[PDB]
Ligand binder design. Structure first.
Ligand SMILES: C=C(C)[C@H]1CN[C@H](C(=O)O)[C@H]1CC(=O)O
Length: 250
């Protein structure tokens, strides 16, 4: 009947409109994407913000998945539409549609990863949890392995808790702090006032964000075909351009 969609606040994907109720309280790339996939697939839905404010990781002790991934695995949500990075660990427990948006870990400064690894004057870090941190932690690639060893033992801490915190740290560090984040957030922030940040070098890896559903879900097939169709029509490119560039501030 009414499909339960779990999502999360992260600009410009899902934001509180700056007096409203239900789905109309929200706006952003993922809000527009949810309406488009629902329209194509022919379903009614309710957007809900994930209670724990997490994307999805499996606790090492309890082995239970938290965040949006957890909501899908334990049957609390029917679908997740947000900047949820497609990773192998998540793919083992949930299904992802083809990418609706491409990205890679990138560097934000006020070059290359190899260049950051060989130096010591500019400090660098990632979020204290998430796919970016996990990529560095489990990487068997020499340069990233070195970067991780440096980040985990750096004092004071080079890690931050939110995107906003990583961005602010870059802005106030006089070129002494580089933030490692997904290229999509990097591109978005570059077009946000005070317009003083920049992406440098190529991405460290390659992946995307995908619509997620519980394993064996009936909705899976349909949502995947919808993503392929919206992509083919150029709609996803227009939608990214709308939220990143048309609404840019620089
Ligand atoms: C915004 C957050 C915390 C998310 C977005 N995609 C990643 C994920 O799905 O884990 C996280 C960012 C990152 O790890 O750099």
């Amino acid at each position: 009947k009414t499909v339960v969609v779990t999502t999360i606040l992260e600009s410009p994907y899902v934001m509180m409109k700056k007096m409203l109720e239900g789905n109309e309280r929200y706006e952003g790339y993922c809000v527009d994407l949810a309406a488009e996939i629902a329209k194509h697939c022919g379903f009614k839905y309710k957007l809900t913000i994930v209670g724990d404010g997490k994307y999805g990781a499996r606790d090492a002790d309890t082995k239970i998945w938290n965040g949006m991934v957890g909501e899908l695995v334990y049957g609390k949500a029917d679908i997740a539409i947000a900047p949820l990075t497609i990773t192998l660990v998540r793919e083992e427990v949930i299904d992802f549609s083809k990418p609706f948006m491409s990205l890679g870990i990138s560097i934000m400064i006020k070059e290359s990863a190899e260049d950051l690894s060989k130096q010591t004057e500019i400090a660098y870090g990632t979020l204290d949890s998430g796919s970016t941190k996990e990529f560095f932690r489990r990487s068997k690639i020499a340069v990233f392995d070195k970067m991780w060893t440096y980040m985990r033992s750096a004092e004071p801490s080079v890690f931050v808790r939110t995107t906003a915190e990583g961005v602010a740290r870059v802005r106030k560090s006089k070129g002494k702090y580089a933030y490692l984040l997904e290229s999509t957030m990097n591109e978005y922030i570059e077009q946000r006032k005070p317009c003083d940040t920049m992406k440098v070098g190529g991405n460290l890896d390659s992946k995307g964000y995908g619509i997620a559903t519980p394993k064996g879900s009936s909705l899976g097939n349909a949502v995947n075909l919808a993503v392929l169709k919206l992509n083919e029509q150029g709609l996803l490119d227009k939608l990214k351009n709308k939220w990143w560039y048309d609404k840019g501030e620089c």
